[PDB]
Amino acid sequence: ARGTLYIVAAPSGAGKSSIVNATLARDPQIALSISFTSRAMRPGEVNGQHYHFVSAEKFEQMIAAGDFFEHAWVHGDWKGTARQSVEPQLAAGQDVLLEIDWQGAQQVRQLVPGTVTVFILPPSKQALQDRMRKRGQDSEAVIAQRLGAARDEMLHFNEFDYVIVNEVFDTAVDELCAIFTASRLRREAQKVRHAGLIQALLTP
């Protein structure tokens, strides 16, 4: 039985990665994917942990080679989910969670129909600024640019099945866990998981 594909999107600085990491620790049957990006490393980021950082030429080499399940030009740099991070896992029955923008989510929706997609909103525009200057010394000009890029991402929230507002951290984690739990209870998934039981109950 194929794994379920999950998408959790949010502008950076809304706290999605902390929510996802806490959610997966509680629900370990879902694997996280590490994206590729040609954007420059920001302070505090670790290559091979937050992203696989590569050159633009290497990334475009990987585009041309067909290495990406989805990829997109995100805020003036390449971002991408490697084919090897998703397609074999899903084919092997492993659930996979992608943290990608709306452009990537749209490509994934056309590739995998039943993807479960969640958007996480910050509790205010101010909340975005606060989390950004606690991740590293960014200039006012860069903070203004990233805030603008955040609004651009949030304009596409309506494309997602669920919306979580990250007001209380432990509550947002509970809510993302409820969404993941509920998705395994959907009729079509349960028909597969309990096919034998259903056959027994409906037999005369």
Ligand X SMILES: Nc1nc2c(ncn2[C@@H]2O[C@H](COP(=O)(O)O)[C@@H](O)[C@H]2O)c(=O)[nH]1
Binding residues: 10-18, 35, 39, 42, 51, 70, 79, 99, 101, 131, 135, 153, 166-167
Q: Report the distance separating Cα 151 and Cα 165, nearest Å.
A: 15
Partner whose footprint covers residue 153, from its own copies, ligand X, none (CB < 5 to 8 Å by kind): ligand X
Q: Which is nearer to ligand X, 156 or 184 (CB)?
A: 156
CA-to-CA dists, residue 164 to 80, 132, 144, angstroms: 24, 20, 24
Q: What is the greatest pairwise CA distance in the chain?
A: 72
- Considering only 4, 12, 115, 129, the residue that binds ligand X (CB under 6 A) is 12
Q: Does 161 bind its own copies (CB under 8 A)?
A: yes
Q: Report the distance separating Cα 172 and Cα 15, nearest Å.
A: 10
Q: For strands 68-74 and 77-82, give the pairing.
A: antiparallel
Q: Does 143 bind its own copies (CB under 8 A)?
A: no
Contact 159, 117 (CB under 8 A): yes
- Of the candidates 37, 5, 18, which has an alpha carbon nearest to the alpha carbon of residue 122? 18
Q: Does 1 bind its own copies (CB under 8 A)?
A: no
Beta-carbon count within 10 A of 148 CB: 10
Q: Does 164 bind its own copies (CB under 8 A)?
A: yes
Mark 18-47 with x for binding to its own copies (rule: CB under 8 A) and - for no binding.
------------------------------
Q: Using CB under 8 A, list all residues that contact its own copies.
A: 118-119, 121-125, 128, 144, 147-148, 151, 154-155, 157-158, 160-165, 174-175, 177-179, 181-183, 185-187, 190-191, 194, 197-198, 200-202, 204
